[PDB]
Amino acid sequence: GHMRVCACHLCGGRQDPDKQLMCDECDMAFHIYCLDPPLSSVPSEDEWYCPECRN
Ligand SMILES: [Zn+2]
Ligand SMILES: [Zn+2]
Numbered sequence: 001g002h003m004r005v006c007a008c009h010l011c012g013g014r015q016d017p018d019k020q021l022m023c024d025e026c027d028m029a030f031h032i033y034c035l036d037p038p039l040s041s042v043p044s045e046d047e048w049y050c051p052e053c054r055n
Pocket of ligand 1 (some may be wrong): 008011030031
C-alpha cells in the first residue's frame with residue numbers, strides 16, 4: 001500500500017501525528033491545536049468529523 005501524506009489541512013504540517021485527527025467524512029487531517037477553537041486532547045473515540053463536515 002501507499003503512504004498518505006496527511007498534512008494538517010489548516011497549517012500544512014505533519015508534526016505531532018499523535019495529536020492529529022482524521023475526518024471520517026472528508027479524510028483530511030487536523031492538529032487538535034489548529035482547530036478554532038482548539039481541542040484540548042485527542043479523544044479516545046475513533047470517530048470524528050471536522051468543522052466543515054459536522055455541519
Ligand atoms: Zn495544524
Ligand atoms: Zn471533514
